[PDB]
Amino acid sequence: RGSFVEMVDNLRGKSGQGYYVEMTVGSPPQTLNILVDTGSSNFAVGAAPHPFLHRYYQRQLSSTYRDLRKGVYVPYTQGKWEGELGTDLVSIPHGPNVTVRANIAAITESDKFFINGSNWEGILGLAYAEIARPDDSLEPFFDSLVKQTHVPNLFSLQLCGAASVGGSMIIGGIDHSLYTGSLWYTPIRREWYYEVIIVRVEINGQDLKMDCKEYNYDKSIVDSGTTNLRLPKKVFEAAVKSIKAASSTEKFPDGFWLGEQLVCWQAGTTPWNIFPVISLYLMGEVTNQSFRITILPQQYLRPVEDVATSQDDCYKFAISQSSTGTVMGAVIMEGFYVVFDRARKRIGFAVSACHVHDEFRTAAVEGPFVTLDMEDCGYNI
Ligand SMILES: CCS(=O)(=O)[C@]1(C)CC[C@@](CF)(c2cc(NC(=O)c3cc4c(cn3)OC(F)(F)O4)ccc2F)N=C1N
Numbered sequence: 001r002g003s004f005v006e007m008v009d010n011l012r013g014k015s016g017q018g019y020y021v022e023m024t025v026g027s028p029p030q031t032l033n034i035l036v037d038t039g040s041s042n043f044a045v046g047a048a049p050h051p052f053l054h055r056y057y058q059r060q061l062s063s064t065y066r067d068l069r070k071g072v073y074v075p076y077t078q079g080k081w082e083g084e085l086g087t088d089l090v091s092i093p094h095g096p097n098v099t100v101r102a103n104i105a106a107i108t109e110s111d112k113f114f115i116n117g118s119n120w121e122g123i124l125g126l127a128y129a130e131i132a133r134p135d136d137s138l139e140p141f142f143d144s145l146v147k148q149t150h151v152p153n154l155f156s157l158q159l160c161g162a163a164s165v166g167g168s169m170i171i172g173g174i175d176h177s178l179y180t181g182s183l184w185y186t187p188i189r190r191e192w193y194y195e196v197i198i199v200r201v202e203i204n205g206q207d208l209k210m211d212c213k214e215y216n217y218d219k220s221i222v223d224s225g226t227t228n229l230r231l232p233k234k235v236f237e238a239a240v241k242s243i244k245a246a247s248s249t250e251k252f253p254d255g256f257w258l259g260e261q262l263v264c265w266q267a268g269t270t271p272w273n274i275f276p277v278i279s280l281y282l283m284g285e286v287t288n289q290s291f292r293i294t295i296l297p298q299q300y301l302r303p304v305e306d307v308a309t310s311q312d313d314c315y316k317f318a319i320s321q322s323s324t325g326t327v328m329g330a331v332i333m334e335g336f337y338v339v340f341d342r343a344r345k346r347i348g349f350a351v352s353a354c355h356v357h358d359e360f361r362t363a364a365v366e367g368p369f370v371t372l373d374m375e376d377c378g379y380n381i
Contacts, residue, residue: 004175010094011036011159011167012119015305016227019159019330020120021169024091025104026062031055031093033120036157036169038194038340039223039327041132042074043090043141044083045122047106052114053121057106064089064101072105074133079112081105090141095171098149102141105133123225126155126340130192142342145171153343157224160354161334162298163305167354179337179350184291184365186282188345189378193221196347198326199290199374200281201235203242210238212377219325219379222338222347226329229278229300230322239278239319246276259320262304264312272297272358278319280332283374284367285346290374291367293349295335298356299363302331325379335363 012033013019020033025045032045032055046056059065068085083105090102107113107122114121129136129143139147146153151172158178160167168178189195198215201208217232231239240257250271255261265271275297284290302318318331335355339348355363 001173002176004170004173007094007170008168008175008177009166011169013165014118015163015165015303017115017118018120019165019167019224021095021124022093023122023124024093025057026059026088027064028061029091030057030061032057032122034122034124035120035225036126037123037223037225038126038157039221039225040123040125041127041129041140042072042105042123042125042138043102044074044081044105044107044125046114047083048108050110050114052116052118054119055121057104057122059086059106062088070134072133079110081107081110081113083107085138092171095169096149096151098145098151100141100145100148102144103138126224127193128191154339154341156337156339156348157333158337158352158354159224159330159333160352161330162356163303174339178353180353181351181365183337183339183348183350184367185285185341185346185348186291187285188347191345193219194223194340194347196220196222196328197283197374197377198280199283199371199377201239202279202281202292203239204246204276205279206242208235208238208242210235212373213379215326216377217325217379218381220328221325222328222333224330224333226327227302227331228318228320228327228329229295229331230320230327230329232325233321233323235326236319236321243276247274249274256317259317262307262314262316264310264314267313270301270313270315273360275301277361280328281369281371282349283377286368288370288372288374289367290369290371291349291365292369293332293336294364294366295332296357296361296363298358299331299335336365
């Protein structure tokens, strides 16, 4: 259709707390704010009165609730949640005009999961069944939505940064007002995470000249549920070394680059221009063809507004090292309109109409480029 006016601006959030959509669960409808997460595959909601929660799923109030009589325990690298599986009727007030019977994990115990001060009480896992918990028989929400309705097998995300954030989750299509120029598509390598292949990395146009397999060790994913651009250790080391050299006009402590401390400047006097652009070349749709996406310091140097001990403008270096491969989190996604074209196993990138930039530099999506041996960039076990 190309125009989904009802769904524009259906995302809200706060800096560092993520992007949530309004959803309803059960009959009569119970309203919940739900984190949009392309890096997981469970629809999981608070169902107990945790003190951090504004709202929670009260199963006893729902006539359409069905118990699946099975639990689920989900440990993460930091915290944890545990829940009871069921199904109920789910809709998205500012989404398609439909109602779906979806799997819902009713969260009954958690640790370091809900954020104190956040305005969301659940997670919408938008990735594929392969990574669903406890196993791939638990149908993810979007799979149910496509199966039960005529909603096309596609969604797109415009995450708008820079303190309230906003944006759009267009379910079933693309809204052309949300981007400028053309969309460029990269293949979904495998349907588990939204896995992609990075084929080349530039800092201010200067190639890292690394074995491209390192860029995707052990994978590269697109994840709206991650803040940072997360890079594998060796790639992070090379990237930081290059960013240091590009920004050597000013010197910063080692801890800043490791995200161990913040750096603060006098109000409205951030030297963005001293900081380099970051370009990721992604595998294209065609043999030997790639395209380039480019982000600015506006994306990777992120303001920290909850600093009581300082009066200045303080920033977090939001590129970090990873043991689980590249993660293209909000640092990447805030620059772009991202199309998760499930029907065609591809992810589209275009310059976001809402991305934060200055008058000298702009986030960019450019192609085509000639890149050989792009298949060798993918990692195999
Ligand atoms: C493999 C991906 S993962 O499964 O390990 C994981 C990174 C952690 C676990 C989970 C749920 F599965 C998860 C994510 C979050 N997000 C955020 O809080 C959050 C905060 C943000 C953001 C994006 N997001 O952009 C921002 F605006 F800058 O601020 C919170 C609790 C969770 F429990 N989702 C992922 N994508």
